[PDB]
Design a binder for this molecule. Structure first.
Ligand SMILES: [Zn+2]
Ligand SMILES: [Zn+2]
Ligand SMILES: [Zn+2]
Length: 370
């Protein structure tokens, strides 16, 4: 969907309607705590709005916005994971970004940083909105068809007519109560986003493409935007319960992958063009290392990049991972010095590590973070 850096546009409409919708739909018997947190969320509406549009303006490592797309039919066609996932980081999709920003929002909320947490939740909603945009779910880019920018411009100009203020259900109903059933956020999120994205993808094929009529476009925009609103409300509801209901999710959960959110310093030569690796060592002495590399330019000055690592061993628990590190490798005589500001590691929905660094890394060097 379209959005603007000042926090206005289709994306902000969706996020804003999301809190209005959740408020109308909240059942009268819902615990007081759920309403208190909703209220703090409303106080921070401006950040939710800024977050909901920001990813389209982030100077990142994605030259063609690949992470704003997601095909809901791939992420489980039951084709085995490529062997390269074991030595190289894997790129993000709109679905993986929802999990990433959600984990960052829950973490900041618990630490009491409401503005930053709300901003993060907004970015999570931005990616859900993308997962619910017909052209994004069908992977039809601006290069494949002029229908992409046209449909989005068309939806942007009529955004006010596409607003809704209820999902048609109250929190006591199935739509919302089914959101609390699965204790595991990541798996609930993936299938929740998937049903909405599959619906959006079908709308590309049935009503939104360049071979359809203006009335078909009207129906596609209406359903896709209403769906984007309903799903956003669903996420906010899940969020409020997660940050309110204090349950520790079990440290006995298998760790299939780790995600690192790395912030490079803003000093002049903080960025580097050398090879950068992320690695781990278990209690059992086994180690695994991956090259960090996204489609665009990684580790530039002041950037914030994400890297996903698939573990070779799928029966490990977070506690089995004894050490974690990043490592720089040069090809020239002295190489390119790197100064990371902060690194966060996420596992199964929780940020298990948050380390400020602000120290230079030189030559071929290994810097331990855990
Ligand atoms: Zn968008
Ligand atoms: Zn688009
Ligand atoms: Zn986007």
């Amino acid at each position: 969907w379209d959005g603007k850096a000042d926090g206005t546009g289709t994306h902000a409409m969706i996020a804003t309607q999301g809190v209005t919708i959740l408020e109308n739909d909240l059942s009268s018997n819902e615990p007081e705590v759920i309403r208190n947190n909703l209220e703090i969320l409303k106080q921070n509406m401006h950040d939710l709005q800024l977050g909901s549009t920001y990813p389209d303006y982030d100077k990142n490592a994605y030259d063609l916005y690949q992470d704003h797309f997601w095909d809901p039919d791939t992420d489980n066609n039951f084709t085995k994971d490529s062997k390269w996932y074991l030595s190289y980081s894997i790129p993000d999709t709109a679905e993986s970004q929802i999990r990433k920003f959600s984990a960052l929002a829950r973490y900041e909320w618990k630490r009491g940083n409401y503005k930053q947490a709300t901003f993060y939740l907004g970015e999570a909603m931005h990616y859900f909105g993308d997962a619910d945009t017909p052209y994004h779910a069908a992977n039809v880019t601006a290069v494949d068809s002029p229908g992409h920018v046209k449909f989005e411009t068309f939806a942007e100009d009529r955004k006010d007519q596409y607003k809704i203020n209820t999902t048609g259900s109250k929190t006591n109903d199935a739509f919302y109560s089914n959101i609390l059933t699965n204790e595991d956020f990541n798996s609930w999120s993936k299938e929740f986003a998937r049903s909405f994205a599959k619906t959006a993808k079908d709308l590309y094929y049935s009503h939104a493409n360049m071979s359809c009529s203006w009335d078909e476009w009207d129906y596609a925009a209406k359903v896709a935007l209403a769906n984007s609103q309903k799903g956003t409300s669903g996420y906010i509801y899940r969020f409020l319960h997660d940050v309110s209901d204090g349950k520790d999710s079990s440290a006995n959960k298998n760790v299939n992958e780790l995600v690192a959110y790395i912030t490079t310093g803003g000093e002049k030569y903080a960025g580097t063009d050398d090879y950068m690796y992320f690695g781990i060592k278990t209690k059992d002495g086994q180690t695994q290392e991956w090259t960090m590399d996204n489609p665009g330019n990684d580790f530039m000055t002041g950037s914030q990049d994400t890297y996903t690592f698939k573990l070779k061993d799928k029966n490990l628990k977070i506690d089995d991972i004894q050490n974690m590190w990043i490592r720089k490798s040069k090809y020239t005589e002295f190489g390119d010095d790197y100064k990371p500001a902060n690194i966060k590691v996420i596992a199964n929905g929780n940020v298990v590590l948050n380390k400020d660094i602000n120290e230079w890394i030189s030559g071929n060097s290994t810097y331990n973070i855990k």
